């Protein structure tokens, strides 16, 4: 996969902030995994600086098996911040786009193309 350009990742973060304002987000790897498995995950954001890599190694193939768009954020600090959280977050899932449904689907199409 080509490195997703910074504008697309920033749009993903903006969509995450917007869904935090209005919609519903599952922050945390357990909640995001449950949301992907249940098929409720509109968009999955995955941090790239995870130690160990076992924490979020399954998210990609799982979301590709369940047809959930996903993107890799640079690191977990601002990923946790975008979800309004005082800690880091290895992955968040947007289960309710709220006011970002249009931008979430735009990001989904862009990810589908860039693949």
């Amino acid at each position: 996969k080509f490195d997703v350009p910074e504008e697309l990742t920033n749009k993903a973060l903006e969509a995450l902030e917007l869904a935090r304002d209005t919609g519903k987000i599952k922050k945390g790897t357990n909640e995001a995994t449950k949301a992907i498995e249940r098929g409720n995950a509109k968009l999955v954001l995955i941090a790239e600086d995870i130690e160990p890599a076992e924490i979020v190694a399954h998210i990609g193939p799982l979301s590709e098996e369940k047809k959930a768009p996903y993107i890799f954020i640079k690191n977990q600090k601002e990923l946790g911040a975008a979800s309004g959280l005082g800690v880091s977050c290895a992955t968040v899932a947007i289960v309710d786009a709220g006011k970002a449904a249009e931008m979430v689907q735009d990001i989904a199409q862009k990810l589908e193309a860039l693949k």
Binding site: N30, T33, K34, R38, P52, A53, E54, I55, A57, H58
Partner: protein, 196 residues
């Protein structure tokens, strides 16, 4: 199914040479060989194993990776009289398992803590690696915790050195009940060490 991500970690470590854990193993063993005997780490390598063994993300709980050599009890040939049954020592491995050796070295490095449990995390032709979970019985966070404040009792000090961890009880023959445990429970020493 709706399985937790701990289940995915468990699956990845079930057959590690057939999953992505093999490449992580190739990259990690270099770093681990560079390290010493007892290394503290921020997070467990296998989070599901640590959590099922009692690890919690709270203050007073420490996880450490220990390095232990392979093979049996490195033994010296006696230089005095023996009866040919006690002369040979090359094939005599010990009665102390490698995991319990790792637990006791971790305990030695951390005099104020108590070993909770440990799990296998890797090995090569010369070393095995275990991650040992240790608890601080004198931390107020641990004292408040009602699932862990048993470790603040006087009989819980020196757990790993008295064979009271899961690996130690496995080494004492008390991993099972019934037949075969005639000379193991309640202790090895209670039957003149004839069990094990």
């Amino acid at each position: 199914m709706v399985k937790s991500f701990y289940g995915y970690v468990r699956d990845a470590w079930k057959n590690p040479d057939e999953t992505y854990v093999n490449e992580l193993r190739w990259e990690r063993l270099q770093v681990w060989r560079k390290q010493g005997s007892v290394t503290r780490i921020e997070r467990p390598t296998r989070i599901d194993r640590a959590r099922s063994l009692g690890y919690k993300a709270k203050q007073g709980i420490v996880v450490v990776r220990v390095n232990v050599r392979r093979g049996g009890l490195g033994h010296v040939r006696p230089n005095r009289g023996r009866r040919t049954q006690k002369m040979g020592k090359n094939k005599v491995s010990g009665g102390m398992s490698i995991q319990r050796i790792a637990e006791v070295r971790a305990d030695r490095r951390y005099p104020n803590l108590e070993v909770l449990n440990s799990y296998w995390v890797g090995e090569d032709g010369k070393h095995k690696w275990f991650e040992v979970i240790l608890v601080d019985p004198h931390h107020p966070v641990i004292k408040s915790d009602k699932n862990l404040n048993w470790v603040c009792d006087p009989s819980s000090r020196g757990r790993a050195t008295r064979g009271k961890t899961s690996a130690g009880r496995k080494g004492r023959g008390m991993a099972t009940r019934g037949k075969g445990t005639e000379k193991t429970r309640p202790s090895i020493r209670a039957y003149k060490s004839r069990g094990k």
